Each structure stands twice: as structure tokens, then as C-alpha cells.
Amino acid sequence: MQKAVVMDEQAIRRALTRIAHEIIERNKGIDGCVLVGIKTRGIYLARRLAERIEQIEGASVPVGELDITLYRVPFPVTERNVILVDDVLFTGRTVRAAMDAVMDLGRPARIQLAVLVDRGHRELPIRADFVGKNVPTSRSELIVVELSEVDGIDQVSIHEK
Amino acid sequence: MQKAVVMDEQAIRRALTRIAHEIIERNKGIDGCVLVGIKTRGIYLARRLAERIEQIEGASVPVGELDITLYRVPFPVTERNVILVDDVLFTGRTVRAAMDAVMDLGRPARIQLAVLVDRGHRELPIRADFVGKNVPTSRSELIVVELSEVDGIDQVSIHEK
Amino acid sequence: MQKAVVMDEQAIRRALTRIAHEIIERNKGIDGCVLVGIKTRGIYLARRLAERIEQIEGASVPVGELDITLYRVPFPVTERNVILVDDVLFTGRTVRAAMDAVMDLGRPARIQLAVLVDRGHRELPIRADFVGKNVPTSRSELIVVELSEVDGIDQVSIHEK
Amino acid sequence: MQKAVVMDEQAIRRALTRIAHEIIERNKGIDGCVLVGIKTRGIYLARRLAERIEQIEGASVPVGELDITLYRVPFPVTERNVILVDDVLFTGRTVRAAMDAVMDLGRPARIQLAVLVDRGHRELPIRADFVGKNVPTSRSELIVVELSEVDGIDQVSIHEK
């Protein structure tokens, strides 16, 4: 069941907007940049960031989709700044899988990672470059990220089964 | 003599814009917020942030100005979120004085600090909540912050003498 | 009611030992340093630190006791690196009162901050230089630090009515 | 030219000792922990950390060696806390290669990374869990790590043409 809300629609909107500005700032423009969404909600987050960047800089950013699932759609990559987008950073194992998939498709100038929430408990020396919000959790708790495009609403909560 | 430019006009713009978004985000809105610029350059930086915030939230924010030297433009304080604004965070000593002044005027809910650049070398346990850019410097180097309103251009550089 | 135990005697012991090494490391030896314990329990932590450092460096370190009650023990301050020692870093207002109290005694070369736990919720631009453990908490939760010298046991827990 | 010495023998000594306590501290001991050094100097730093951890816990930590050139030696992996050890963390591409190598030999409980120096300029979403010293650098500077076992002396410096 749901224990508590840690991000409402407004907090998610402001977080994603501030991230877009962070991406633009740390790359001095989105030139050579590419957003690649993971799983399902990461893709929707990626598309939102692309629109925000486009809205801010006037330049559009390519959005690609990556389907990990196993290994535990095409796009630029080569000599590009590949920014992975995902909803929650946990153990970090998915990112590793995602990185292999990126360099299996080319050689990027670099790979970055943007997540809506970092809930800690990393099991790999991996960190997000951009973070919507750091949400302290116990190892057993569950982070549920709901996005309007798939869940009907924007909300991040902590659950416990 | 100018040793190196660490922030050009565009970098300063993207930093101040991102900071404005960080400010609204952590405060979940502008309500109760008060920007207090510190003598000279910190004042202009507070004005620029106040404008960016207004542009973002559709509502303006109270902007006061603090002359730390004079302490040896009034504004709200009590139960307010006072965001001190300065150009460079250095030893941190100047910030303590700024805190004493703010609380001389009232009892704020919180005091925050935003600086364009944090050049390290603190001599007190004070850290900025918002930082335009962290600029490592030696103990002998000088940080020169130029703002268009006073120096004709927006630029941050490292000087040696 | 006790909601959780976040540090047992072994964790506390290992955090304190590691901090002693961090203190020596960041100051390139303990020459000119002074450990000033705050309130009540910060005094014991400072004593344990002084003892650990002594056994590591083979050189003793001055220990003072500061009561910050008035700001909310004849020890060296001026020209010294005053390392404040407290049990918990919360809003940081205790630190501001402590910095004021230290400035009424002398002119330190610099002031640092070491705490056993940082539970977040800062209301001032203050951060510890050394932290035993970051214990995320809700605003309504209480951090209880028990030390053998005063409570019969070493333990840090989270309480809430 | 050697334009700056960032770590001398004593600093390295105190940094490694501090790292050992941190490692033990975050793992609540070393039970199930394995140290794995890469390239050449990482191996030496791993042996040292291993030596330091023995004097603290009274038990040896397995030490493995990893040759990465073929990615761009025994030790248990599965269910173990594998601690990668390298001298410098730069782009982080070596670490990604090192990780693939680790999970090629098994399924560890977690993989952590310890490095003597972090010089920034990450090109992958990788971070070290234990850092001897963060040394800011320009893109054209080079980090040279000298260890007595191979270079006759312990020293970290910044070089530039």
C-alpha cells in the first residue's frame, strides 16, 4: 500500500523544468546532445525534457528509445552526448545494461544520466548527473512513479507491500 | 592581470536562470520568499533573479538590499524565506554578518544563500544553497566578477598580481 | 516512541574513528587545532575525538567546552582552527549561536564543524565539515543521541510520539 | 612540466588510512569484501588498503588483480562486495570496462570503487565511493601518480606541456 507522497504534480513539473536548464547549462547548448529514454516511463520523461529544452533553446533534441528488460530504436550516438533518462535510480544495474546498449550502437563523446528520483541503495559505482529529487528509502520500501501518459497522473510515492 | 575567464556572459545567464528555477523549486513557489542582495554586485544579481522568477511564476518577489559595511533598504523578514544573494562565496565571514543583519530586522523561517561563484577557502562552516559555478582557486589568485550594470560586461575571471 | 535505531555502538565507534582520521587529514596534522564540544553531549564526542587523534598522531589536542544557551572553560581560540563538535546538526541555528559564542572569546583562524549525525532540514547556510552519518528524517521526527558517559549506552535512534 | 604537487607521501599515507576506515565503516566490517586493483598502480593501492584493513579488523581481505587493456586475478566474485581500486578516476571508461570484467567472473552482491584521486571530467555516469582526494584539473592537464613500489616515491602531481 501507499505510505506517502514525496512528489506531487507541481514538484515533478518544477523538477523536470530545472533539469532541462541544467542539461542546457552543463552542455552550453544541446548541440550534439541526444536524449535516450529507458523502460517505459523514462521515455515519456525523455520526451518531456526534449520539449522543455526545445521550448528554452529553440532547438529540438533527438529522442531515442531503449528497451532493456532483458540483458538485465536507433538514433545518433556516435560522437554525441547521449543522455540516458529514467524514472528511478536504485541499484544502478539497469544503467550498466543501458550503457552497453549505447556503445553497442556506436561511440558517443559521453554518456550522461538523468532520473526523476534517486532512492539510494546503489550496488554499482554509478550516479546520476541530473536528479529530480533524492528520496531516502529503506531497502524494502518501493518507489512508485506515476506519469500522466501512462498512469493518468503525475506523482511519486513510497509504498510497502 | 587576467589569468583566465571562468564564466562568459552566456554562462552567467544560463547559471542565473537555472538558479532561479532551483530557488522556486526548493521553496515550492515564491510565497514567503524575499531576496536580499549584498552591497554592490550581489544587489544586481538579486534583481536579475527577481526578474527571472517573476517571469517564471507570474508574481514578483520582494527585493531588499544589504550594505554590510554600513552595518558595521528595509524589507520583510519574520516568518519569511530570506535568500541572501552575493557574487562570490569566499571565507564565509561576510555571510555571518549578513545573517546577523537579517535577524536584526526580524525572525525569518529560513535564511538561504545564493552566489554566482563559490571559490572555496571557507573559514567558517557556511555553504551556499545555490551556486552559479564552483571555481577552484589558489590562495593567491583573485576572482573578478564583472556585471554589465557596473562593468559594461558579464564575465568572471581569475587574476594574479 | 522509538521508530528506529540508526547507529549502534559499533557504528558510532567506527564513525568517530574515521572522523579523527578525516580531521587530521584535512588539517595536515592537528597543529593549531582545538576541539570545542558544544551543549552537553558534544563535549563527550570532542573528548573521544581528542583521544583518538592523540593515539594516531602522538600529539595531544586542546579540548574546550562551549555553552551556547545564552546565544540561542578557558581554552585557546584566537589564531586557532576551532573545530566545533556537536551531536546533531539540524536547522543549524545551534551552529550560528556557537559561532557567535566563539567570536565572543577570540578571533579564530577558522571554524570547522564535526557532528555525529546530520538529519537535514537546514534553515541556515550551514553545513558540517565532518559527519558521522546522514540520517534522513521527517520534520516531525526526533533524533535521540545516547552516549555511554551520560545515557549508559552508545546509540542513535529516531523517535516520534 | 610538473606545475603542481597535489599529494606528498604523508598526504597519501593519511588518505589511504582514512579510506580503509571508510571502507570498513560503510560495510560494517569487511566480511565478504574483496579488493580488486586494476592496471598497475591500482594493484599496489589495493595491496596497501588490504594491509591497512588487516591492522584494523584482524583479518585479511582477498586481493585480486585485473588487466583492463583488453576491454578499453582469482578472488571470489559471486555474492561478494567487490571493491575496485584504481589510482585515478578520469573519464571513467576504465571502470565500465572493469565492471564488465567483474560480472564476467560472477554475480557480486555489489561493486564499489575506491580511487586515490578524482580529477573530474567524467564521460560516463560513474562516481567513486571512496576518494583519496578530489583534484580539480583543466582538460589539458595530466595527473601523474607515483608510488614507491614503481616510481621510487609516493606523490601525486599535475603536469602540463
Cα separation, B160 vs B153, whole angstroms: 20
A152 touches chain D (CB under 8 A): no
Distance CA D20, CA A60 (A): 48
Give the determination technique: X-ray
List chain A residues with CB under 8 Å of B17: 21
Asked if A43 contacts A91 with a C-beta cutoff of 8 angstroms, the reply is no
Q: Does A21 touch chain B (CB under 8 A)?
A: yes
**Which amino acid makes up residue A118?**
D
The three cell numbers locating residue B120: 572555496
Give phi and psi for D42, each to the nearest 5.
-65, -40
CB contact at 8 A, D45 and D76? no
Report the gap between the CA of C153 and the closest CA in chain B (Å): 30
Amino acid in position A133: K
Distance CA B133, CA B136 (A): 10
Other C-beta atoms within 10 Å of A73: how many? 9
Q: How far is A24 from chain B, CA to nearest CA, in Å? A: 8
Cell numbers 533553446 correspond to what residue? A57
Q: How far is the first Cα of chain B from the last one, in angstroms, to the nearest whole number?
A: 6
CA distance A118 to B94: 35
Cell of C99: 559561532
Q: Return the SS3 of A8.
A: coil
**Do the chains contact at C18 and D15, CB–CB below 8 Å?**
no
Angle at alpha carbon of residue D84, lines to D83 and D87, rounded to 5°: 130
Greatest alpha-carbon span in chain C: 46
Whether residue D22 contacts residue D71, with contact meaning beta carbons closer than 8 Å, is answered with no
* List of chain C residues whose C-beta atoms are within 8 Å of the C-beta of residue D17: 21
CB D148 within 8 A of CB D154: yes
Rounded Cα–Cα distance for residues B23 and B32 (Å): 12
Strand order in the sheet with C142-146: C2-7, C155-159, C142-146
What proportions of chain D, in percent to the nearest 5, are helix, strand and coil?
30, 30, 40
* Calpha distance D54→D42 (Å, rounded): 18
Q: Does B9 touch chain A (CB under 8 A)?
A: no
Residue D28 and residue C10: Cβ atoms within 8 Å? yes
Determine whether the interchain pair A125/D109 forms a contact, defined as Cβ–Cβ distance below 8 Å.
no
Of C109, C112, C123, the CB nearest to B125: C112
Any A CB within 8 A of D97 CB: no
Distance CA B119, CA B4 (A): 14
Residues in C touching B90 (Cβ below 8 Å): none
Residue B84: strand pairing partners:
B36, B113
- Terminal Cα distance for chain C, rounded: 5
Query: The cell 549584498 sits on which residue?
Result: B38
Q: Do C21 and D21 touch (CB under 8 A)?
A: yes
D18 touches chain C (CB under 8 A): yes
CB B94 within 8 A of CB B38: yes
Contact between D64 and D73 under an 8 Å Cβ cutoff? The reply is yes
Tell if the CB–CB gap between A18 and B18 is shorter than 8 Å.
Answer: yes
SS3 C14: helix
Taking CA atoms, A94 is separated from A42, A69, A122, B157, D125, in Å, by: 12, 8, 11, 41, 12
Please tell me if residue B17 touches chain A, with a CB cutoff of 8 Å: yes
Amino acid letter, A157: S
Closest CA to D85 of D22, D40, D26: D40
Cell numbers that stand for C114 in this block: 564535526
Contact B102, B54 (CB under 8 A): no
Provide the terminal-to-terminal Cα distance of chain D, rounded to the nearest Å.
Answer: 6
Query: Quick one: CA dihedral A76, A82, A88, A93, positive or negative?
Result: positive
CB contact (8 A) between residue D28 and residue C15: no
Q: Is B76 exposed, middle or buried (0-12, 13-18, 19+ CB in 10 A)?
A: middle
Tell me the chain D residues in contact with residue C28 when contact means C-beta distances shorter than 8 Å.
10-11
Concatenate the DSSP letters of all residues of B59-118 into one string.
S---EEEE-TTTT------TT-EEEEEEEEE-SSHHHHHHHHHHTTS---SEEEEEEEEE
Cβ contacts of residue B111 below 8 Å, gap of 6+? B82, B83, B84, B99, B102, B103, C123, C124, C125
* Element (DSSP H or E) covering residue B159: strand B155-159
Instruction: Cell numbers for D40, please give them.
Output: 598497475
Nearest-angstrom CA–CA distance, C47 and C77? 17
- Phi and psi at B148, nearest 5°, equal -50, -40
How far apart (Å, rounded) are the C-alpha atoms in residues C135 and C156? Answer: 10
Contact B85, B47 (CB under 8 A): no
H or E element at residue D99: helix D93-102
CB-based contact B75:B36 (threshold 8 Å): yes
Partner chains of D (3+ C-beta pairs under 8 Å) = A, C
Distance, in Å, from the CA atom of D120 to the CA atom of D154, rounded to the nearest integer, reads 21
Nearest CB partner across the interface for C14, out of D14, D18, D25? D25
Q: C62-78 as b/e, with b when 16 or more CB fall inside 10 Å?
A: bbbbbebeebeeebbbe
Shortest CA distance to A113 belongs to which of D92, D88, B17, D115?
A: D92
Is A93 within any annotated ligand binding site? yes
B127–C127 C-beta distance less than 8 A: yes
| d(C-alpha D143, C-alpha B8), whole Å | 27
* Residue A35 burial (C-beta neighbours within 10 Å; 0-12, 13-18, 19+): buried
CB within 8 Å: C18 and D14: no
Locate the DSSP E strands across chain D.
Answer: 2-7, 33-38, 63-66, 81-89, 110-118, 130-134, 142-146, 155-159
Q: Which amino acid is at B161?
A: K
The Cα–Cα gap between B9 and B145 comes to 11
Beta bridge partners of C122: none
Q: Do D18 and C22 touch (CB under 8 A)?
A: yes
Name the residue among B31, B124, B47, B142 with its Cα closest to residue B79: B31
- Dist. CA A101–CA A79, nearest whole Å: 15
Task: Give CA–CA dist A32/A18, Å, rounded.
Answer: 20
Classify domain C1-161 by CATH number: 3.40.50.2020
Cell of C136: 534522513
